[PDB]
Amino acid sequence: VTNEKGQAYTEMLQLFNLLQQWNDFYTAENANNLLVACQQLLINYNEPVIKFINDENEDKSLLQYLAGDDGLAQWQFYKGFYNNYNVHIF
Amino acid sequence: VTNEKGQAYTEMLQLFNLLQQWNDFYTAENANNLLVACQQLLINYNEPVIKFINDENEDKSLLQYLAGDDGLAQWQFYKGFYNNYNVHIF
Amino acid sequence: VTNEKGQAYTEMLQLFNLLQQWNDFYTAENANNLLVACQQLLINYNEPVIKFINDENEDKSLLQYLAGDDGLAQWQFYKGFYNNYNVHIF
Amino acid sequence: MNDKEKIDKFIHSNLNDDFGLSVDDLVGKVKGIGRFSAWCGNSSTKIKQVLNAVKSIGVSPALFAAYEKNEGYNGSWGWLNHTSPQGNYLTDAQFVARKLVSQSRQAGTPSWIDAGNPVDFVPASVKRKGNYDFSHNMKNGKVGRAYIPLTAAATWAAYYPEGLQASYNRVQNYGNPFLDAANTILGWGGKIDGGGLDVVARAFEEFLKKLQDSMQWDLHSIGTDKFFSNQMFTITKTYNNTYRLNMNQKLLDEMKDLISRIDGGSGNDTGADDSDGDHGGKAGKSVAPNGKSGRKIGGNWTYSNLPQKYKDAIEVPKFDPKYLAGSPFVNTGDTGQCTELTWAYMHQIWGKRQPAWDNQVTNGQRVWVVYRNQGARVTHRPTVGYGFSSKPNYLQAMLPGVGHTGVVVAVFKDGSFLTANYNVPPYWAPSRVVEYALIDGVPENAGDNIMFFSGIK
């Protein structure tokens, strides 16, 4: 049980650091938005997010793990997510 | 199993949002430090942190849950923690 | 008299520069708070502050000069000071 | 680049500038160099710890390493020359990195005179130009802001390099800290120089491909020569030599749904009578879907900041947090979710514990199915006291496959309605803050995009 809580904290920090590369952190509001966006990704899309975190490929996309290879599905997911959290997940 | 990972993600976000009230987020460096500090608190002091997160008292102190009612012990803990993470936990 | 005014301005600049090492300056509000804090220290604790400014020891602490070697007294002083000015004086 | 251009670009670089060198590039290059040799024992692991620590504090590993190489090793001094060591190698490196970051942001003036050997030889014209550059051109967090105030050698190196010579300063020959650090970083291979729109395009290309996919299926003959339609397209004879191509309504819905809703478009699911049937229901007021898809025409107000006219129009009791207590969403980590408000508020309005799940994932778009499976009616009419399920684009639904849910608390003569919601901006889960939003009516052909369900009786 102790390992599982430690792993969840590591997964959240890893996802946050990856998404931070595509998100401006100048404002405190955006920093809060990315934190909320990461916790909603881990709660609703755990298996996709864990695959994305553990992928060592330079061209890896979280959208591919979340919506598959269909660009229109990826776009519709991204647009819905960005409207809700103001966070980039490319 | 699914519930435990969701709960650890919620506890992390709740602790981060509480500690954010005492920590300036203007710099990206401070944001990473608070994320690491919250993970280290939940990994090493899970039971105290869960009590603090679930306390509805306005005057609740995380230091009281971590070091007890002794102000010198609370100060020694706070000083060691602040030196290591540059994070306020009052 | 001319020397005394020059000395007080040097003491204020020296204290401000020392305390600046422990205080994030990103915001104008924090810069204003440190200015007021340094003046209140030099007005109410001149002798302790002058000893701290003239100490060449790497481990020197302004709290030791203000509250003595008792860690609980140093904590109580620091907590009251930080609450009033939002400034670190370790 | 001449030496003056190197110094100028270097002092104007950010204190955290990597200079094109990673921590891994530096670890091999700093072996044998002063304190990296004496304190870290040339250990790649200890060197990486120091360089990562200074980087995390906001100081360039390349700048910190270049400084140590040029300054040299004195056992009595810490990583910053003329300072005692502070604790162990790592603690001292972190202390020096914090001092450099503080100094760079610090109020400062160039140190025109060496404190140890005070000779004023620098022309007042040079001092004025250097003071102007340092105060107006050199922003906080720059390399020059960290070093120019600390020493006269740094000030002379930046604005009067000839002052480093004993001829000019009348004391001794000084090293050039900026040129030596710049040359060391360049020698190491470091360099001194001083949005989903495509996704939109890919989406359009997919739609074009989707048009191809619809066409893949073979047509059937509708009646005789007059028509030849399938389920997506109609071939209708126009004249002896003419056929006009119409499109089946399904096709328009098939992709039109894709435009707004990625999956589940409209299921033509069993609905409710156009008649309000208030008698049929427990109570409350309803309005017919009026078209004008629209969306939230105002909202996210807490009860305290809700405009009085909308507050007066609320026909349901104000939400009481006591209904949340004992919530099944607390155990699942779903505290403050829109489904939790729907469950608790419908429990308050209907007086019975409402369903949270049906052995499937329950979310904003599907919660109406959970209630319907328990005998909860459901309708396309926004009805006061009824829960709603909305796929993305509707009633604040932002995520495809998750949707949004809440309770209808008022309906207006223009067909607009007020909703009570959780997990919407600015109060995301797990805040449990009730937010009121005005919605612009309902599209006539929304179907399962928007469903309005009652509470179980």
Residue numbers in the entry:
A (entry chain D), B (entry chain C), C (entry chain B): 1 to 90
D (entry chain A): 1 to 194, 211 to 473
According to the publication:
Staphylococcal picoviruses are a group of strictly lytic, short-tailed bacteriophages with compact genomes that are attractive candidates for therapeutic use. Here, we report the structure of the complete virion of S. epidermidis–infecting phage Andhra, determined using high-resolution cryo–electron microscopy, allowing atomic modeling of 11 capsid and tail proteins. The overall structure of the Andhra virion follows that of other phages in this group, with an isometric head (capsid) around 500 Å in diameter (vertex to vertex), connected to a 400-Å-long, straight tail surrounded by 12 appendages. The head has icosahedral symmetry, with the tail attached to a portal structure located at 1 of the 12 fivefold vertices.
To resolve the tip density, we carried out another masked reconstruction focused on the tail tip without the application of symmetry, reaching a resolution of 4.9 Å. An AlphaFold model for Andhra gp10 revealed the two expected domains (GyH and CHAP), separated by a helix-sheet-helix linker domain (residues 211 to 277). The tail tip lysins insert into the knob and stabilize the internal loops that hold back the terminal protein and the DNA, thus coupling cell wall penetration to DNA release.
